[PDB]
PDB file of C-alpha atoms in Angstrom:
ATOM      1  CA  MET P   1      -4.840 -22.581  18.690  1.00  0.00           C
ATOM      2  CA  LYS P   2      -3.338 -25.129  21.490  1.00  0.00           C
ATOM      3  CA  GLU P   3      -1.002 -26.505  18.657  1.00  0.00           C
ATOM      4  CA  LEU P   4       0.629 -22.964  18.349  1.00  0.00           C
ATOM      5  CA  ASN P   5       0.977 -22.403  22.407  1.00  0.00           C
ATOM      6  CA  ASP P   6       2.546 -26.139  22.122  1.00  0.00           C
ATOM      7  CA  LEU P   7       5.277 -24.657  19.429  1.00  0.00           C
ATOM      8  CA  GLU P   8       6.195 -21.737  21.078  1.00  0.00           C
ATOM      9  CA  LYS P   9       6.655 -24.246  24.385  1.00  0.00           C
ATOM     10  CA  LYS P  10       8.755 -26.464  21.916  1.00  0.00           C
ATOM     11  CA  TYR P  11      10.513 -23.966  20.636  1.00  0.00           C
ATOM     12  CA  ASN P  12      11.050 -21.468  22.865  1.00  0.00           C
ATOM     13  CA  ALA P  13      10.082 -18.774  20.646  1.00  0.00           C
ATOM     14  CA  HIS P  14       7.607 -16.559  20.017  1.00  0.00           C
ATOM     15  CA  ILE P  15       5.182 -16.728  17.028  1.00  0.00           C
ATOM     16  CA  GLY P  16       2.411 -14.218  15.335  1.00  0.00           C
ATOM     17  CA  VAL P  17       0.255 -15.942  12.554  1.00  0.00           C
ATOM     18  CA  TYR P  18      -1.934 -14.132  10.664  1.00  0.00           C
ATOM     19  CA  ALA P  19      -3.689 -15.983   7.837  1.00  0.00           C
ATOM     20  CA  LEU P  20      -6.533 -14.971   5.546  1.00  0.00           C
ATOM     21  CA  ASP P  21      -8.788 -17.216   3.433  1.00  0.00           C
ATOM     22  CA  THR P  22      -9.423 -14.760   0.260  1.00  0.00           C
ATOM     23  CA  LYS P  23     -12.191 -16.699  -0.723  1.00  0.00           C
ATOM     24  CA  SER P  24     -14.192 -17.407   2.020  1.00  0.00           C
ATOM     25  CA  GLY P  25     -12.769 -14.590   4.046  1.00  0.00           C
ATOM     26  CA  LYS P  26     -12.161 -16.991   7.116  1.00  0.00           C
ATOM     27  CA  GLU P  27      -8.898 -15.735   9.361  1.00  0.00           C
ATOM     28  CA  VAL P  28      -6.723 -17.820  11.322  1.00  0.00           C
ATOM     29  CA  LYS P  29      -4.880 -15.782  14.426  1.00  0.00           C
ATOM     30  CA  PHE P  30      -2.304 -15.881  16.846  1.00  0.00           C
ATOM     31  CA  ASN P  31      -0.641 -13.640  18.456  1.00  0.00           C
ATOM     32  CA  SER P  32      -1.860 -11.248  15.333  1.00  0.00           C
ATOM     33  CA  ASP P  33      -1.700  -7.615  17.451  1.00  0.00           C
ATOM     34  CA  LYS P  34       1.734  -8.201  18.633  1.00  0.00           C
ATOM     35  CA  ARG P  35       4.425  -6.054  16.661  1.00  0.00           C
ATOM     36  CA  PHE P  36       7.654  -7.946  15.258  1.00  0.00           C
ATOM     37  CA  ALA P  37      10.496  -6.569  13.039  1.00  0.00           C
ATOM     38  CA  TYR P  38       9.656  -7.573   9.164  1.00  0.00           C
ATOM     39  CA  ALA P  39      13.112  -7.440   7.817  1.00  0.00           C
ATOM     40  CA  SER P  40      12.959  -8.327   4.209  1.00  0.00           C
ATOM     41  CA  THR P  41       9.772  -9.304   3.883  1.00  0.00           C
ATOM     42  CA  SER P  42       9.260  -5.842   3.385  1.00  0.00           C
ATOM     43  CA  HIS P  43      11.008  -6.330   0.078  1.00  0.00           C
ATOM     44  CA  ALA P  44       7.585  -7.663  -1.237  1.00  0.00           C
ATOM     45  CA  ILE P  45       5.215  -4.809  -0.366  1.00  0.00           C
ATOM     46  CA  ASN P  46       7.858  -2.176  -1.723  1.00  0.00           C
ATOM     47  CA  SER P  47       7.766  -3.865  -4.617  1.00  0.00           C
ATOM     48  CA  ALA P  48       3.958  -4.030  -5.122  1.00  0.00           C
ATOM     49  CA  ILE P  49       3.563  -0.279  -4.327  1.00  0.00           C
ATOM     50  CA  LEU P  50       5.875   0.471  -7.259  1.00  0.00           C
ATOM     51  CA  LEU P  51       4.028  -2.048  -9.623  1.00  0.00           C
ATOM     52  CA  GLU P  52       0.893  -0.190  -8.675  1.00  0.00           C
ATOM     53  CA  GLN P  53       2.594   3.077 -10.754  1.00  0.00           C
ATOM     54  CA  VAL P  54       5.182   1.387 -13.617  1.00  0.00           C
ATOM     55  CA  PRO P  55       2.662  -0.376 -16.053  1.00  0.00           C
ATOM     56  CA  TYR P  56       4.530  -3.742 -16.444  1.00  0.00           C
ATOM     57  CA  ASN P  57       5.443  -2.552 -20.279  1.00  0.00           C
ATOM     58  CA  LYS P  58       7.318   0.202 -19.165  1.00  0.00           C
ATOM     59  CA  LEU P  59       9.485  -2.180 -16.801  1.00  0.00           C
ATOM     60  CA  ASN P  60      11.996  -1.937 -19.072  1.00  0.00           C
ATOM     61  CA  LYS P  61      12.692   1.804 -18.111  1.00  0.00           C
ATOM     62  CA  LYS P  62      16.527   2.014 -16.582  1.00  0.00           C
ATOM     63  CA  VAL P  63      17.777   3.689 -12.974  1.00  0.00           C
ATOM     64  CA  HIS P  64      21.846   4.733 -12.578  1.00  0.00           C
ATOM     65  CA  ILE P  65      23.171   2.988 -10.249  1.00  0.00           C
ATOM     66  CA  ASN P  66      26.310   4.390  -8.348  1.00  0.00           C
ATOM     67  CA  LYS P  67      28.838   3.701  -5.770  1.00  0.00           C
ATOM     68  CA  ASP P  68      26.921   5.614  -2.983  1.00  0.00           C
ATOM     69  CA  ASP P  69      23.485   3.378  -3.783  1.00  0.00           C
ATOM     70  CA  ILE P  70      25.367  -0.052  -2.202  1.00  0.00           C
ATOM     71  CA  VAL P  71      24.557  -1.549   0.780  1.00  0.00           C
ATOM     72  CA  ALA P  72      25.730  -4.936   2.346  1.00  0.00           C
ATOM     73  CA  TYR P  73      24.319  -8.006   1.031  1.00  0.00           C
ATOM     74  CA  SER P  74      23.594  -6.689  -2.719  1.00  0.00           C
ATOM     75  CA  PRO P  75      24.627 -10.074  -4.623  1.00  0.00           C
ATOM     76  CA  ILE P  76      23.601  -8.645  -8.018  1.00  0.00           C
ATOM     77  CA  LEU P  77      23.479  -4.914  -7.695  1.00  0.00           C
ATOM     78  CA  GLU P  78      27.208  -4.563  -6.259  1.00  0.00           C
ATOM     79  CA  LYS P  79      27.926  -5.819 -10.378  1.00  0.00           C
ATOM     80  CA  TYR P  80      26.261  -2.556 -11.691  1.00  0.00           C
ATOM     81  CA  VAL P  81      28.001   0.351  -9.844  1.00  0.00           C
ATOM     82  CA  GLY P  82      28.432   2.737 -12.715  1.00  0.00           C
ATOM     83  CA  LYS P  83      25.601   0.770 -14.963  1.00  0.00           C
ATOM     84  CA  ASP P  84      22.195   0.671 -15.481  1.00  0.00           C
ATOM     85  CA  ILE P  85      19.500  -1.298 -14.505  1.00  0.00           C
ATOM     86  CA  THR P  86      15.876  -2.147 -15.819  1.00  0.00           C
ATOM     87  CA  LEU P  87      13.083  -1.627 -13.104  1.00  0.00           C
ATOM     88  CA  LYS P  88      12.001  -5.144 -13.811  1.00  0.00           C
ATOM     89  CA  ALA P  89      15.795  -6.494 -13.067  1.00  0.00           C
ATOM     90  CA  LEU P  90      16.019  -4.370 -10.140  1.00  0.00           C
ATOM     91  CA  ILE P  91      12.334  -6.149  -8.772  1.00  0.00           C
ATOM     92  CA  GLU P  92      13.744  -9.632  -9.891  1.00  0.00           C
ATOM     93  CA  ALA P  93      16.878  -8.808  -7.617  1.00  0.00           C
ATOM     94  CA  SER P  94      15.116  -7.524  -4.688  1.00  0.00           C
ATOM     95  CA  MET P  95      12.528 -10.569  -4.492  1.00  0.00           C
ATOM     96  CA  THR P  96      14.666 -13.524  -5.622  1.00  0.00           C
ATOM     97  CA  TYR P  97      17.931 -12.829  -4.180  1.00  0.00           C
ATOM     98  CA  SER P  98      17.029 -10.368  -1.522  1.00  0.00           C
ATOM     99  CA  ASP P  99      19.252  -8.057  -2.897  1.00  0.00           C
ATOM    100  CA  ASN P 100      19.066  -4.618  -0.505  1.00  0.00           C
ATOM    101  CA  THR P 101      20.843  -2.237  -3.129  1.00  0.00           C
ATOM    102  CA  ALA P 102      17.720  -3.356  -4.983  1.00  0.00           C
ATOM    103  CA  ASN P 103      15.153  -2.695  -2.619  1.00  0.00           C
ATOM    104  CA  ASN P 104      16.235   0.626  -1.616  1.00  0.00           C
ATOM    105  CA  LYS P 105      16.570   1.802  -5.518  1.00  0.00           C
ATOM    106  CA  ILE P 106      12.578   0.750  -5.556  1.00  0.00           C
ATOM    107  CA  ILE P 107      12.333   2.522  -2.401  1.00  0.00           C
ATOM    108  CA  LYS P 108      13.706   5.589  -3.755  1.00  0.00           C
ATOM    109  CA  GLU P 109      11.739   5.122  -7.105  1.00  0.00           C
ATOM    110  CA  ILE P 110       8.500   5.061  -5.321  1.00  0.00           C
ATOM    111  CA  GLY P 111      10.107   8.756  -3.589  1.00  0.00           C
ATOM    112  CA  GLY P 112      11.041   7.615  -0.154  1.00  0.00           C
ATOM    113  CA  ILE P 113      10.432   6.161   2.536  1.00  0.00           C
ATOM    114  CA  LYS P 114       7.419   8.684   3.803  1.00  0.00           C
ATOM    115  CA  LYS P 115       5.723   7.955   0.338  1.00  0.00           C
ATOM    116  CA  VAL P 116       5.787   4.528   1.397  1.00  0.00           C
ATOM    117  CA  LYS P 117       4.046   5.101   4.724  1.00  0.00           C
ATOM    118  CA  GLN P 118       2.015   7.643   2.762  1.00  0.00           C
ATOM    119  CA  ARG P 119       0.255   5.027   0.543  1.00  0.00           C
ATOM    120  CA  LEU P 120       0.256   2.107   4.203  1.00  0.00           C
ATOM    121  CA  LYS P 121      -2.489   5.001   5.425  1.00  0.00           C
ATOM    122  CA  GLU P 122      -4.105   5.387   2.250  1.00  0.00           C
ATOM    123  CA  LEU P 123      -4.408   1.063   2.422  1.00  0.00           C
ATOM    124  CA  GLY P 124      -5.497   1.802   6.580  1.00  0.00           C
ATOM    125  CA  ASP P 125      -2.599   0.325   7.815  1.00  0.00           C
ATOM    126  CA  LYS P 126      -1.091   2.642  10.407  1.00  0.00           C
ATOM    127  CA  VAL P 127       0.327  -0.121  12.200  1.00  0.00           C
ATOM    128  CA  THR P 128       3.491  -1.084   9.568  1.00  0.00           C
ATOM    129  CA  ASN P 129       6.106   1.338  10.240  1.00  0.00           C
ATOM    130  CA  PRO P 130       8.746   1.473   8.115  1.00  0.00           C
ATOM    131  CA  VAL P 131      11.622   4.481   9.276  1.00  0.00           C
ATOM    132  CA  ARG P 132      15.011   3.014   8.175  1.00  0.00           C
ATOM    133  CA  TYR P 133      16.375   1.395   4.601  1.00  0.00           C
ATOM    134  CA  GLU P 134      18.492  -1.612   4.200  1.00  0.00           C
ATOM    135  CA  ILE P 135      20.165  -3.014   6.332  1.00  0.00           C
ATOM    136  CA  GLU P 136      19.467  -1.163   9.025  1.00  0.00           C
ATOM    137  CA  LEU P 137      16.049  -1.875   9.453  1.00  0.00           C
ATOM    138  CA  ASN P 138      16.977  -5.081  10.558  1.00  0.00           C
ATOM    139  CA  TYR P 139      18.328  -3.954  13.933  1.00  0.00           C
ATOM    140  CA  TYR P 140      15.479  -4.367  15.750  1.00  0.00           C
ATOM    141  CA  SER P 141      14.999  -3.657  19.642  1.00  0.00           C
ATOM    142  CA  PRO P 142      11.703  -5.006  21.395  1.00  0.00           C
ATOM    143  CA  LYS P 143      11.749  -1.690  23.376  1.00  0.00           C
ATOM    144  CA  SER P 144      10.978   0.131  19.559  1.00  0.00           C
ATOM    145  CA  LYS P 145       8.786   0.077  16.683  1.00  0.00           C
ATOM    146  CA  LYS P 146      10.933   0.767  14.059  1.00  0.00           C
ATOM    147  CA  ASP P 147      10.715  -1.370  11.227  1.00  0.00           C
ATOM    148  CA  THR P 148       8.070  -3.409  12.815  1.00  0.00           C
ATOM    149  CA  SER P 149       4.362  -4.704  12.061  1.00  0.00           C
ATOM    150  CA  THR P 150       1.681  -7.061  13.222  1.00  0.00           C
ATOM    151  CA  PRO P 151       1.010 -10.319  11.692  1.00  0.00           C
ATOM    152  CA  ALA P 152      -2.646  -8.900  11.359  1.00  0.00           C
ATOM    153  CA  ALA P 153      -1.617  -5.105   9.621  1.00  0.00           C
ATOM    154  CA  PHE P 154       1.037  -6.888   7.526  1.00  0.00           C
ATOM    155  CA  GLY P 155      -1.467  -9.499   6.337  1.00  0.00           C
ATOM    156  CA  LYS P 156      -4.641  -7.524   5.274  1.00  0.00           C
ATOM    157  CA  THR P 157      -1.788  -4.603   3.563  1.00  0.00           C
ATOM    158  CA  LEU P 158      -0.298  -7.723   1.318  1.00  0.00           C
ATOM    159  CA  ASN P 159      -4.164  -8.838   0.850  1.00  0.00           C
ATOM    160  CA  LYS P 160      -5.007  -5.099  -0.225  1.00  0.00           C
ATOM    161  CA  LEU P 161      -2.094  -4.912  -2.481  1.00  0.00           C
ATOM    162  CA  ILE P 162      -1.498  -7.546  -4.436  1.00  0.00           C
ATOM    163  CA  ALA P 163      -4.539 -10.269  -3.733  1.00  0.00           C
ATOM    164  CA  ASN P 164      -7.103  -7.865  -4.313  1.00  0.00           C
ATOM    165  CA  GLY P 165      -5.511  -4.283  -5.341  1.00  0.00           C
ATOM    166  CA  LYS P 166      -4.907  -2.511  -7.965  1.00  0.00           C
ATOM    167  CA  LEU P 167      -2.334  -4.136  -9.754  1.00  0.00           C
ATOM    168  CA  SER P 168      -2.943  -5.207 -13.476  1.00  0.00           C
ATOM    169  CA  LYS P 169      -2.861  -9.154 -14.233  1.00  0.00           C
ATOM    170  CA  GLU P 170       0.551  -9.054 -15.924  1.00  0.00           C
ATOM    171  CA  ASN P 171       2.380  -7.063 -13.040  1.00  0.00           C
ATOM    172  CA  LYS P 172       0.521  -9.323 -10.491  1.00  0.00           C
ATOM    173  CA  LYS P 173       1.787 -12.075 -12.537  1.00  0.00           C
ATOM    174  CA  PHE P 174       5.123 -11.299 -12.579  1.00  0.00           C
ATOM    175  CA  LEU P 175       5.590 -10.295  -9.237  1.00  0.00           C
ATOM    176  CA  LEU P 176       3.660 -13.990  -8.179  1.00  0.00           C
ATOM    177  CA  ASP P 177       6.496 -15.720 -10.153  1.00  0.00           C
ATOM    178  CA  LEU P 178       9.643 -14.134  -8.730  1.00  0.00           C
ATOM    179  CA  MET P 179       7.718 -15.181  -5.215  1.00  0.00           C
ATOM    180  CA  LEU P 180       6.626 -18.701  -6.975  1.00  0.00           C
ATOM    181  CA  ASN P 181      10.100 -19.307  -7.955  1.00  0.00           C
ATOM    182  CA  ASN P 182      12.368 -17.999  -5.133  1.00  0.00           C
ATOM    183  CA  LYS P 183      14.801 -20.968  -3.672  1.00  0.00           C
ATOM    184  CA  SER P 184      15.296 -19.324  -0.019  1.00  0.00           C
ATOM    185  CA  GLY P 185      11.597 -19.974   0.890  1.00  0.00           C
ATOM    186  CA  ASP P 186      12.154 -23.826   0.960  1.00  0.00           C
ATOM    187  CA  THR P 187      12.941 -24.650   4.612  1.00  0.00           C
ATOM    188  CA  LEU P 188       9.855 -22.211   5.814  1.00  0.00           C
ATOM    189  CA  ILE P 189       6.224 -22.109   4.757  1.00  0.00           C
ATOM    190  CA  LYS P 190       6.872 -24.128   1.738  1.00  0.00           C
ATOM    191  CA  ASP P 191       8.375 -27.140   3.786  1.00  0.00           C
ATOM    192  CA  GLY P 192       5.277 -27.414   5.802  1.00  0.00           C
ATOM    193  CA  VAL P 193       2.427 -27.068   3.441  1.00  0.00           C
ATOM    194  CA  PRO P 194       0.969 -30.172   1.461  1.00  0.00           C
ATOM    195  CA  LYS P 195       2.521 -31.206  -1.554  1.00  0.00           C
ATOM    196  CA  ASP P 196      -0.399 -29.553  -3.391  1.00  0.00           C
ATOM    197  CA  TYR P 197      -0.101 -26.318  -2.519  1.00  0.00           C
ATOM    198  CA  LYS P 198       1.762 -23.546  -4.353  1.00  0.00           C
ATOM    199  CA  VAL P 199       3.358 -21.368  -1.899  1.00  0.00           C
ATOM    200  CA  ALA P 200       4.589 -17.652  -3.120  1.00  0.00           C
ATOM    201  CA  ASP P 201       7.023 -16.407  -0.382  1.00  0.00           C
ATOM    202  CA  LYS P 202       9.359 -13.898   0.520  1.00  0.00           C
ATOM    203  CA  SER P 203      11.170 -14.805   3.657  1.00  0.00           C
ATOM    204  CA  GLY P 204      12.870 -12.568   5.890  1.00  0.00           C
ATOM    205  CA  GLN P 205      15.253 -12.433   9.192  1.00  0.00           C
ATOM    206  CA  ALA P 206      16.469  -9.502  11.121  1.00  0.00           C
ATOM    207  CA  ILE P 207      19.879  -9.479  13.081  1.00  0.00           C
ATOM    208  CA  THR P 208      18.463  -9.513  16.649  1.00  0.00           C
ATOM    209  CA  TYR P 209      16.222 -11.863  18.353  1.00  0.00           C
ATOM    210  CA  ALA P 210      16.325 -14.653  15.852  1.00  0.00           C
ATOM    211  CA  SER P 211      13.500 -12.839  14.146  1.00  0.00           C
ATOM    212  CA  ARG P 212      12.853 -15.300  11.813  1.00  0.00           C
ATOM    213  CA  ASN P 213       9.492 -14.419   8.865  1.00  0.00           C
ATOM    214  CA  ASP P 214       7.918 -15.961   5.730  1.00  0.00           C
ATOM    215  CA  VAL P 215       4.918 -14.385   4.202  1.00  0.00           C
ATOM    216  CA  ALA P 216       3.145 -15.910   1.383  1.00  0.00           C
ATOM    217  CA  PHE P 217      -0.067 -16.245  -0.768  1.00  0.00           C
ATOM    218  CA  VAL P 218      -0.516 -20.230  -0.432  1.00  0.00           C
ATOM    219  CA  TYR P 219      -2.661 -21.931  -3.484  1.00  0.00           C
ATOM    220  CA  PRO P 220      -4.408 -25.109  -2.171  1.00  0.00           C
ATOM    221  CA  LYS P 221      -5.572 -27.582  -4.766  1.00  0.00           C
ATOM    222  CA  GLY P 222      -8.147 -26.479  -6.655  1.00  0.00           C
ATOM    223  CA  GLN P 223      -8.587 -23.207  -5.054  1.00  0.00           C
ATOM    224  CA  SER P 224      -7.450 -20.423  -7.292  1.00  0.00           C
ATOM    225  CA  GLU P 225      -7.645 -17.774  -4.690  1.00  0.00           C
ATOM    226  CA  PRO P 226      -4.733 -17.383  -2.476  1.00  0.00           C
ATOM    227  CA  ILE P 227      -5.019 -18.045   1.264  1.00  0.00           C
ATOM    228  CA  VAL P 228      -2.557 -14.711   2.523  1.00  0.00           C
ATOM    229  CA  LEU P 229      -0.477 -16.188   5.322  1.00  0.00           C
ATOM    230  CA  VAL P 230       1.869 -13.606   7.311  1.00  0.00           C
ATOM    231  CA  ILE P 231       4.236 -15.949  10.296  1.00  0.00           C
ATOM    232  CA  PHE P 232       6.987 -13.753  11.806  1.00  0.00           C
ATOM    233  CA  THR P 233       8.446 -15.300  14.870  1.00  0.00           C
ATOM    234  CA  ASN P 234      11.516 -14.374  17.225  1.00  0.00           C
ATOM    235  CA  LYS P 235      13.172 -14.949  20.790  1.00  0.00           C
ATOM    236  CA  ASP P 236      13.972 -13.680  23.857  1.00  0.00           C
ATOM    237  CA  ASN P 237      17.803 -13.211  23.753  1.00  0.00           C
ATOM    238  CA  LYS P 238      19.864 -10.863  21.115  1.00  0.00           C
ATOM    239  CA  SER P 239      22.109 -13.223  20.032  1.00  0.00           C
ATOM    240  CA  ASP P 240      19.714 -16.163  19.676  1.00  0.00           C
ATOM    241  CA  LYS P 241      19.640 -18.489  16.423  1.00  0.00           C
ATOM    242  CA  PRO P 242      16.514 -19.122  14.907  1.00  0.00           C
ATOM    243  CA  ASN P 243      14.968 -22.963  13.950  1.00  0.00           C
ATOM    244  CA  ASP P 244      13.179 -22.755  10.440  1.00  0.00           C
ATOM    245  CA  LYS P 245      11.556 -26.001  11.510  1.00  0.00           C
ATOM    246  CA  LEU P 246       9.453 -23.908  13.889  1.00  0.00           C
ATOM    247  CA  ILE P 247       7.952 -21.785  10.493  1.00  0.00           C
ATOM    248  CA  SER P 248       7.421 -25.203   8.771  1.00  0.00           C
ATOM    249  CA  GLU P 249       5.731 -26.563  11.497  1.00  0.00           C
ATOM    250  CA  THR P 250       3.426 -23.826  12.225  1.00  0.00           C
ATOM    251  CA  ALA P 251       2.426 -23.550   8.542  1.00  0.00           C
ATOM    252  CA  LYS P 252       1.596 -26.910   8.883  1.00  0.00           C
ATOM    253  CA  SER P 253      -0.584 -26.188  11.794  1.00  0.00           C
ATOM    254  CA  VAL P 254      -2.336 -23.282  10.102  1.00  0.00           C
ATOM    255  CA  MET P 255      -3.054 -25.421   7.094  1.00  0.00           C
ATOM    256  CA  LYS P 256      -5.365 -27.699   8.764  1.00  0.00           C
ATOM    257  CA  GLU P 257      -7.688 -24.377   9.715  1.00  0.00           C
ATOM    258  CA  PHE P 258      -8.599 -24.878   6.056  1.00  0.00           C
TER     259      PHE P 258
END
């Protein structure tokens, strides 16, 4: 982890890494028990929990969207005020466009923040701590645990929900294809891993402390089992700007371990 220490020194940043090859069980950890704001990488978790309870063939069920649901940065859902949207389109908006209104509506469908924390506990995750909806969950403070998790607890939860969970084959493919085709993560994990690798990711950026994250299921050439990879990073000052090359370079070093 001498390359990771050096990357912190090089980017003047803090890095939290958890990587699990689900084939061998091999793990690479660096500051894996340190808390970081997960930001919108949480959209992946909420989407998976809902998909555990709605069969693929029923993803056509619609939900009404009204003015009260709209929150900042909802490029798709702002067009749906007073209209109905299917659960499938909500999930696509939330993952592909990081639409915040879609994610909150998904949390509501699941039953609220309370029901999400319940399911995390059932999965054995007592670390991930959702308290707020979007976009307030992005107001991160080092002195608060609100909406934070550690790279290991978040990585183990993604593994249990998606890589080795109870989702059907269709739902799992559906979610993963959204993650594979998302362009917002191109400068992140996808930029650092080799060209033979498929990267299904969900990026995130909080409002404060240059909180820049990327979680992904990486598929090396020849392996069909994904390597779960969670990279959370932040800086020491509230208004610091993040450098994505930090995550691209982190993914590259970590991949050398597999």
